[PDB]
């Protein structure tokens, strides 16, 4: 039921468009983040994901990576596609944002965490 | 300088292998984990990732998603590839391991978080 | 403006109650969780916390530790107390829920991470 | 066996001194962090914790909060006290660092995560 394929929106108002999945559960798409942590003109950026195939079909877990075209960072999302009842799909995801640092010494503070809620876009 | 391409081993005995790396930053690979949260014999699994090429640094950040073959769960990693003083490449990484719940009421207890340091296996 | 002192409820039906608040920032309280990762009847548990008073902001950050009475685990929370537009105080919070492993080889799989938004219960 | 009480050190070289625990498993102590995320003269700061009492004695989980006297943030640690074999104690902890933001709007990026290893101090 729960199909990643399509267009979704967030609670911060971010939007994401996701291609078609495969036998291997692969997919690609694009991301437009509403917010940034960098002082630097936001752009549409790419994602590469995967969606689990094993028997838990109905509501699968998944995860993608986003390659900021406008910053030196990377973000990764992972979560589950749910169907409340209505037949309303919801992505419940949690993500990790890695920033660039110049010496391993700094590594310690390069990782931020948090959530995101996605539901789909009309029309 | 620091590249994803190759065989790597991490502090827990897990090994993975990367390869591709478009001019995009995309790469696929396989990952063989030493460990698990599940009670099913481990099987090589595939991974999909990306490398940041913005302001082409000698230590880019990255991130990948491991689509577990033996489980219904998913793991995502992000980090940086640094060039340590020894002259050695080190992957400092962090992750979320998302597993499946049967109901969206149990979401809150589905995501684990941890660290991993990768090193080159090849001699 | 925003103070920890009181009864609060969060998006999962859990309630807690704070009280103290030295000139230090220390406070104790009790917490009654609606939810659990364990299979043992829940019992009110105590908490110990602190409030930042550096550059006495109207929205200080804080953090507390809930010493579960019904479990062998521990939870820690941190966040900020904000004054929302409505004029309402909101506790935006994030947590780690650490549980016990019998062997240090299983460490890597012991810590969960999540979010919680607290609101005032009192009328 | 594993007693929080005493003086410990970190992998980043941070030191911490921990008072005596109670029946309620409480404790207090002081922290000297080797590193900071703020441009602001490091100081010895206080912690308030708790250490679980329920039957899992030998190696207990625990958690403390640190009230930076020199910044607007808070950090929280939670983890387990281990005894490899030697009779060497090790704290394996993971922590959450909350920074101050000026509008709930920003909340999204105020949380950093990571680890820390503690072993004790001679003499
Ligand atoms: C997301 O899509 C909606 C649909 O109309 C649009 O109004 C909004 O501006 C988009 N926002 C971003 C940040 O892409
Ligand atoms: C890593 O590679 C070695 C070498 O063959 C293998 O024995 C080990 O099982 C691999 N690690 C795991 C646990 O998959
Ligand atoms: C929160 O308070 C209410 C009111 O008595 C109570 O019924 C509820 O159980 C408390 N929540 C939990 C699950 O502890
Ligand atoms: C920690 O304690 C050791 C013990 O001699 C000392 O040399 C070191 O400077 C201390 N470091 C900090 C950051 O407190």
What this model shows, in words?
It is classed as biotin-binding protein. The entry lists the keywords biotin-binding protein. 4 copies of one chain form a homotetramer. Chain A has 123 residues and is an all-beta fold. Chain A has one domain: Lipocalin (Beta Barrel). Chain A is built from no helices and 8 strands. Chain A has strands at 6-10, 15-18, 28-32, 45-51, 61-67, 74-83, 89-98, 111-120. Chain A has an 8-stranded antiparallel beta barrel with strand order 1-2-3-4-5-6-7-8. Chain A is globular. In chain A, 41% of the residues are buried. At the A-B interface, strand 4, strand 5, strand 6 and strand 7 of A face strand 4, strand 5, strand 6 and strand 7 of B. Residues 9, 13-15, 32, 34 of chain A line the site of one 2-acetamido-2-deoxy-beta-D-glucopyranose (NAG).
């Amino acid at each position: 039921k729960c199909s990643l394929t399509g267009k979704w929106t967030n609670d911060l108002g971010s939007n994401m468009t996701i291609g078609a999945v495969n036998s291997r559960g692969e997919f690609t798409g694009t991301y437009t983040t509403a917010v940034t942590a960098t002082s630097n003109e936001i752009k549409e950026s790419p994602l590469h994901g995967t969606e689990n195939t094993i028997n838990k079909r109905t509501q699968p877990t998944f995860g993608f990576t986003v390659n900021w075209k406008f910053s030196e960072s990377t973000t990764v999302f992972t979560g589950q596609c749910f169907i409340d009842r209505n037949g309303k799909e919801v992505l419940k995801t949690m993500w990790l944002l890695r920033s660039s640092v110049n010496d391993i010494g700094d590594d310690w503070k390069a990782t931020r965490v948090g959530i995101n809620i996605f539901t789909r876009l009309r029309t």
